[PDB]
Amino acid sequence: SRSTGVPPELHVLLPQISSMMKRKIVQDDILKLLTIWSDAYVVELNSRGELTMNL
Amino acid sequence: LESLSNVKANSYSEWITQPNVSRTIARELKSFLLEYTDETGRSVYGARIRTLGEMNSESLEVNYRHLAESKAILALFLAKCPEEMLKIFDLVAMEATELHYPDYARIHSEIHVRISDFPTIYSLRELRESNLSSLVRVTGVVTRRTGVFPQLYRNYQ
Amino acid sequence: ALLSQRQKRYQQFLAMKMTQVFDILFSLTRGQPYTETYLSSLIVDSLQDSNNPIG
Amino acid sequence: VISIMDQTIKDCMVSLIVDNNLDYDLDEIETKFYKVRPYNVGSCKGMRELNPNDIDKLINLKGLVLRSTPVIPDMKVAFFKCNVCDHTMAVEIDRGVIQEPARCERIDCNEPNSMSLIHNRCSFADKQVIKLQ
Amino acid sequence: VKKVDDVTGEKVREAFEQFLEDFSKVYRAQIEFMKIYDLNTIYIDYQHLSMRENGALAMAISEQYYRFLPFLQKGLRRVVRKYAPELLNTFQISFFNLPTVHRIRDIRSEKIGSLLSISGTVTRTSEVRPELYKASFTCDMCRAIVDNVEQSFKYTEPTFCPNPSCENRAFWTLNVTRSRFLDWQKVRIQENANEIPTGSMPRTLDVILRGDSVERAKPGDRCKFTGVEIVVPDVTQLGLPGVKPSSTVRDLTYKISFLACHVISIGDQEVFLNSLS
Ligand SMILES: [Zn+2]
Ligand SMILES: [Zn+2]
């Protein structure tokens, strides 16, 4: 749905994820996934001060 | 054949309208509706089809996330071109449930698919132009409501 | 002397403002029959919305 | 009289300035159109006294303004573009009529009914309707 | 058949692109900023425009804006192709900062097609609606398809089937998918108290907003608009006195309206001090 490859911010992704999980997912949960597989997602920070993740 | 659906040389809607691709994902949809696993829950959709054929319900309900797991690109095509994808999902759900409940077409002619738990949510002020011809989920208040009348017949409101 | 400097300063306020005034006539004014009364009402209305309006 | 005055003004520029060798500030005046408007006709009989025999004869009146319409743009020049070869014409108005070309004027392009009117490239003239009491 | 080359517009487009490429480099940066956030509109400051070709470029664009407008669109579409193909694979222009503001009484037919800025207190606003910008059609006798059908303020159907194998004319099917729509809103503005002499009536005028400019006009706001003057079909002029022109028969009455490409509402010490000499 995005015409550009810039990933959306985490503060949008987590609410969308939380509804699907039937359980609230927070920032610290993402770091658990990164520990298991380092190359799972790109974790570059947005200049707005919002965390981002991408394929 | 599922991997071949990923390789696209046209637009999203253009590729789906191809008869070979349409039949490809029709088989892919048909495979999923009976084959799924939720550990302890196993094939939940098998029970979903079971209770739906028990009730003879026209409302074919599906969870969004489950389709995206077994069939990765099949669910995403449903999101980008809902009209084209649900057009054949009408027939696939008809044939897949007739695997469990044959002669269903003897009473009901069509099976309109009801998607559920779609994750992306938009407000009435966020409906950009890029969201045209796409599946969207919005929340609001019912202000005006019309009556029930048949449409060229089936009910309309 | 103080009153003279008040006079000297105030004309420079008009002497430098005229730079942003000849762009008013140059842009969308097209004939000689324009009289000073019509021009004066136009100048005040163009600078009326600015932070430094003119009478 | 108006055409005479226009010619007279043209003569005045030619005779009184350049023929008199005073100056040459008349180059553009050869092209611009003038008009002279008579105002001080003798006192007239008023609106309620007018008669059908007075038609087309200049009169004088006084009154009060009630309603004024905005500046209505009246057509004077029509701009046509050919819908297949994009050729542009310039058709003027003669006595309040617009003559739509039936064929493109170019020799190569002769398609019948191929011309189209472009609304916003035309030239208009200001018309104001005023009501007097 | 070779079409007519409008040498004036092409020269405008060449200068317009050179202005975008060379002017100090916010305009290059602005396009990139649009790419990041999926923006649809580019804004240009007129004082920047007047600083090239010693103002001649700005004057030519200003006086005949409606004529040159497609040429500016062609100018930018090359640039987004050149430096941001993502945006090209995903478009409006908005001028502002005119040095002169023209009152409602200055709306005269001699300025149709030129660029002007007016000020007027907003009295009404209408709800926004999508407006057909560029439509497409499919033939009826055959299955040919016609794209890029610009409307230009009227419902224009194609005049010919492009395939010589078909003879269809004046029969078409409107496409609702390949066509593009644009936001459109009508605003009624009124002359300010300080514009007119005391004891006189204030005038009224209707302004048209498109694209992102919609919903930026709020009733009671002392808005300022920037755009161009257009004429729209009108039937209220009939019945008035005076000889009425005719075309051949068809009636061609018109009324004046204003098309605004930019909307601003005008009513902190460091911000204020920076705007004064
Ligand atoms: Zn032609
Ligand atoms: Zn055809």
UniProtKB/Swiss-Prot annotation, chain A:
- Compartments where located: Cytoplasm; Nucleus
Q: What is the superkingdom listed in this entry's lineage?
A: Eukaryota
The subunit structure is:
Associates with the MCM2-7 complex. Interacts with MCM2, ORC1, ORC2 and ORC6.
Additional free-text comment from the UniProt record? Present with 2190 molecules/cell in log phase SD medium.
Which family is annotated? Belongs to the Cdt1 family.
What is the annotated role of this protein in its UniProt record?
Answer: DNA replication licensing factor, required for pre-replication complex assembly. Faithful duplication of the genetic material requires 'once per cell cycle' DNA replication initiation and elongation. Central to this control is the tightly regulated formation of prereplicative complexes (preRCs) at future origins of DNA replication. Required for the recruitment of the MCM2-7 helicase complex to the replication origins.
Protein name as catalogued: Cell division cycle protein CDT1
Ranked from the top, the taxonomy reads:
Eukaryota, Fungi, Dikarya, Ascomycota, Saccharomycotina
What portion of the full-length protein is represented by this chain?
A: 331 to 385 of 604
Swiss-Prot record, chain B:
Its annotated compartments are: Nucleus
Superkingdom as given in the UniProt entry: Eukaryota
Q: Which family does it belong to?
A: Belongs to the MCM family.
Its job: Acts as a component of the MCM2-7 complex (MCM complex) which is the putative replicative helicase essential for 'once per cell cycle' DNA replication initiation and elongation in eukaryotic cells. The active ATPase sites in the MCM2-7 ring are formed through the interaction surfaces of two neighboring subunits such that a critical structure of a conserved arginine finger motif is provided in trans relative to the ATP-binding site of the Walker A box of the adjacent subunit.
**Self-association state and partner proteins as the record states:** Component of the MCM2-7 complex. The complex forms a toroidal hexameric ring with the proposed subunit order MCM2-MCM6-MCM4-MCM7-MCM3-MCM5; loaded onto DNA, forms a head-head double hexamer.
Extra remark beyond the main annotation: Present with 1690 molecules/cell in log phase SD medium. Early fractionation of eukaryotic MCM proteins yielded a variety of dimeric, trimeric and tetrameric complexes with unclear biological significance. Specifically a MCM467 subcomplex is shown to have in vitro helicase activity which is inhibited by the MCM2 subunit. The MCM2-7 hexamer is the proposed physiological active complex.
**What is the protein's given name?**
DNA replication licensing factor MCM2
Which organism's genome codes for this protein? Saccharomyces cerevisiae (strain ATCC 204508 / S288c) (Baker's yeast)
UniProtKB/Swiss-Prot annotation, chain D:
Q: What is the annotated localization of this protein?
A: Nucleus
The source's domain of life comes to Eukaryota
Q: What does this protein do?
A: Acts as a component of the MCM2-7 complex (MCM complex) which is the putative replicative helicase essential for 'once per cell cycle' DNA replication initiation and elongation in eukaryotic cells. The active ATPase sites in the MCM2-7 ring are formed through the interaction surfaces of two neighboring subunits such that a critical structure of a conserved arginine finger motif is provided in trans relative to the ATP-binding site of the Walker A box of the adjacent subunit. The six ATPase active sites, however, are likely to contribute differentially to the complex helicase activity.
The record's note on quaternary structure and interaction partners says: Component of the MCM2-7 complex. The complex forms a toroidal hexameric ring with the proposed subunit order MCM2-MCM6-MCM4-MCM7-MCM3-MCM5; loaded onto DNA, forms a head-head double hexamer.
A further note on this protein reads: Present with 8800 molecules/cell in log phase SD medium.
Its family remark reads: Belongs to the MCM family.
**Protein name (Swiss-Prot/TrEMBL):** DNA replication licensing factor MCM4
From Swiss-Prot, chain E:
Tell whether Cell membrane is among the UniProt keywords.
Answer: no
BP-aspect Gene Ontology terms: DNA replication; DNA replication initiation; DNA strand elongation involved in DNA replication; double-strand break repair via break-induced replication; mitotic DNA replication; pre-replicative complex assembly involved in nuclear cell cycle DNA replication; premeiotic DNA replication
Residues spanning the signal sequence: none
Q: What does this protein do?
A: Acts as a component of the MCM2-7 complex (MCM complex) which is the putative replicative helicase essential for 'once per cell cycle' DNA replication initiation and elongation in eukaryotic cells. The active ATPase sites in the MCM2-7 ring are formed through the interaction surfaces of two neighboring subunits such that a critical structure of a conserved arginine finger motif is provided in trans relative to the ATP-binding site of the Walker A box of the adjacent subunit. The six ATPase active sites, however, are likely to contribute differentially to the complex helicase activity.
Q: Which cellular component terms (GO) are annotated to the entry?
A: CMG complex; cytoplasm; DNA replication preinitiation complex; MCM complex; MCM core complex; nuclear pre-replicative complex; nuclear replication fork; nucleoplasm
Name the major location. Answer: nucleus
* Additional remarks: Present with 13400 molecules/cell in log phase SD medium.
**Family from the record:** Belongs to the MCM family.
Per the record, residues carrying Phosphoserine are 200
Query: Localized where?
Result: Nucleus
**What is this protein called in UniProt?**
DNA replication licensing factor MCM6
UniProt entry tagged with the keyword Nucleotide-binding: yes
Task: Supply one GO molecular-function term.
Answer: ATP hydrolysis activity
Transmembrane ranges, per UniProt, are none
